[PDB]
Design a protein around this nucleic acid. Structure first.
Ligand code: DG3
Ligand code: MG
Length: 579
DNA sequence: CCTGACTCG
DNA sequence: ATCCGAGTCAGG
């Protein structure tokens, strides 16, 4: 049905200046993964190329790297990074169908071309899973079957571009695609390929010392319990706590007794064993995930880890980070924080530089809600996380520890994003009446925030979606639901999404601005990671002074709000020391 | 394979 | 019933 040339060699007509390009990587983690086939669709026709042929062809490599030869693709970051591992530069990506679909509707969870095509009732292409299979059965099919699939995906991209661009334009999201998400994709590609260097000697020694400590804590828990059991089994643990030891049952889930951290903390007045168990479960996660799990994914020759930043996953416009997740490295407890000493610069005499937006969603909220009490607190450079702390612990602005401030930060965001008196009461282990009284006084200090949250909920019910500063959108069909729980969740998404998503928009723009700046000043410094409202770079020790001005500046100037954006920063010999 | 742990923003 | 957004892991 669909005619294409199964080419044995690259020809001139394949190198047109506009094309849909497919560079197929079957493995989910595309780092150093095989490219199994290439397809090109342009004005002159449809072509399948063998990677061995095409990627060793100097005209084709030239064309890939030519920014004036425009390519339309699906998930160009995947292709760009796979090509980098093949030592080939990909330039000229002008349209990314994945990112287009994601902006039109993040809820569709589009993750292959077929799923994007479905959005415009385009059905002349198969889902990847149907072609490659799943799990132990996953495999590249016979060449003619593979070639047709890749060509059909290219043909789909070729035909779907205008219809997607048109709809994006109708939604005012065209610039969000072309000026924000697509340039960010190339930047993330650079960051993933660069990777972050790991001190495996240090990590392995931490691991050995952690194993000894675990055994010690383990034995202590068995002594306290009067029995050996699997502490890492909530089921077995529940039997020990609520049957053998007869501690009060505070919560159940569908599977049985809850042994959540919140529940165990509340049981501390009944038996000291619950504090030891909380400690054990923390240490065990450090070992399984941040020592063993991390060492498993280190590339042994370079000692680097290469995360994948999923740019088309979260419902709010944030990135996520996978395999490994480098956006959830411990920091809150010193015991875990020490893992960060194993993340080091990739060159000698280089340093890690970390910058963090201050009270970021509180600033964005002030701007969007136009709450005058709040817009003012930032014009007076107040720290609302700390003030809240002083209040909930009756402790004053000098005595507030980082930990207390951390807790207050969850209270602040909790309240603005719709926590109930019950939730705040369970969170601070205080009485519900007191919690309710606190929420009351909070919205008295910031009446505009309260008005904004009431108004954005009604607007969501009327329109069926909410939007961010740069026109990112989330649909919320459930919000007019007759069901209280379903409706309630949707209402709180209406309160939170515009704010968290606007904050995502901002740091994304900041990353693009920051890179352009690094280049024009010919600095060696480059981004390693983004952590939602943090940017982490590495650079020669001599560029620290310049970065101390460049980075906070670019991040603060990414957008202009009705309040000051404020960025905190540090650098040091390891990520840990960048404090 | 999911659930409930722990981790982060 | 009860702030929001994420990922990985051991146990089952
Ligand atoms: N709904 C919600 N969002 C949170 C919570 N913690 C963090 N976030 C979101 C909101 C802020 C954003 C950044 O995290 P941070 O810890 O840096 O919070 P921050 O407000 O910027 O504080 P800081 O001034 O210390 O940098 O991520 C939380 O407990 N609930
Ligand atoms: Mg911050």
């Amino acid at each position: 049905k669909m005619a294409f040339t199964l080419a044995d060699r690259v020809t001139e007509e394949m190198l047109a200046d506009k094309a849909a390009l497919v560079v197929e990587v079957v493995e989910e983690n595309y780092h150093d993964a095989p490219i199994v086939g290439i397809a090109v669709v342009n004005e002159h026709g449809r072509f399948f190329l063998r990677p061995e042929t095409a990627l060793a062809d100097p005209q084709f490599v030239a064309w890939l790297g030519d920014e004036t030869k425009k390519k339309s693709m699906f998930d160009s970051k995947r292709a760009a990074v796979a090509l980098k591992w093949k030592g080939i530069e990909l330039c000229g990506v002008s349209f990314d169908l994945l990112l287009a679909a994601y902006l039109l509707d993040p809820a569709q969870g589009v993750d292959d071309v077929a799923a994007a095509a479905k959005m415009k009732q385009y059905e002349a292409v198969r889902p990847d899973e149907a072609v490659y299979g799943k799990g132990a059965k996953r495999a590249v099919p016979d060449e003619p079957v593979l070639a047709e699939h890749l060509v059909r995906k290219a043909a789909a991209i070729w035909e779907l571009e205008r219809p997607f661009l048109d709809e994006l334009r109708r939604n005012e999201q065209d610039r969000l695609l072309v000026e924000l998400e697509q340039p960010l994709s190339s930047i993330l590609a650079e960051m993933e390929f660069a990777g972050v260097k790991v001190d495996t000697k240090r990590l392995e020694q931490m691991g050995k010392e952690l194993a000894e400590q675990l055994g010690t804590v383990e034995q202590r828990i068995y002594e306290l319990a009067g029995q050996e059991f699997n502490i890492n089994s909530p089921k077995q643990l529940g039997v020990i706590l609520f049957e053998k030891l007869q501690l009060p049952v505070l919560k159940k889930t569908k599977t049985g007794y809850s042994t959540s951290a919140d529940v165990l903390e509340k049981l501390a007045p009944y038996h000291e064993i619950v504090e030891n168990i909380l400690h054990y479960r923390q240490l065990g996660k450090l070992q399984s995930t941040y020592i063993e799990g991390l060492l498993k994914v280190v590339r042994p020759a370079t000692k680097k880890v290469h995360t994948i930043f999923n740019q088309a996953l979260t419902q709010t416009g944030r990135l996520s980070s996978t395999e490994p997740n480098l956006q959830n490295i411990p920091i809150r407890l010193e015991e875990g924080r020490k893992i960060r000493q194993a993340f080091v610069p990739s060159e000698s005499d280089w340093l890690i530089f970390a910058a963090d937006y201050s009270q970021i969603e509180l600033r964005v909220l002030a701007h969007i809600a136009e709450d005058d009490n709040l817009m003012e607190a930032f014009r007076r450079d107040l720290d609302i996380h700390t003030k809240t702390a002083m209040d909930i612990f009756q402790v004053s602005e000098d005595e507030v520890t980082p930990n207390m401030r951390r807790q207050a930060k969850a209270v602040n965001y909790g309240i603005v994003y719709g926590i109930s008196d019950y939730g705040l009461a369970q969170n601070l282990n205080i009485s519900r009446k007191e919690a309710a009284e606190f929420i009351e006084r909070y919205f008295e200090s910031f009446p505009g925030v309260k008005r904004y949250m009431e108004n954005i909920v009604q607007e969501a019910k009327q329109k069926g979606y909410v939007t961010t500063l740069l026109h990112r959108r989330r649909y919320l069909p459930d919000i007019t639901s007759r069901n209280f729980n379903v409706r309630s969740f949707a209402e709180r998404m209406a309160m939170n999404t515009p704010i968290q998503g606007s904050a995502a928009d901002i740091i994304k723009k900041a990353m693009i601005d920051l890179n352009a700046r690094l280049k024009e000043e010919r600095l060696q410094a480059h981004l390693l990671l983004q952590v939602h409202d943090e940017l982490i770079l590495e650079a020669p020790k001599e560029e620290m002074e310049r970065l101390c001005r460049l980075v906070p500046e670019v991040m603060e100037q990414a957008v202009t709000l009705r309040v000051p954006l404020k960025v905190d920063y540090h650098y040091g010999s390891t990520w840990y020391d960048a404090k």
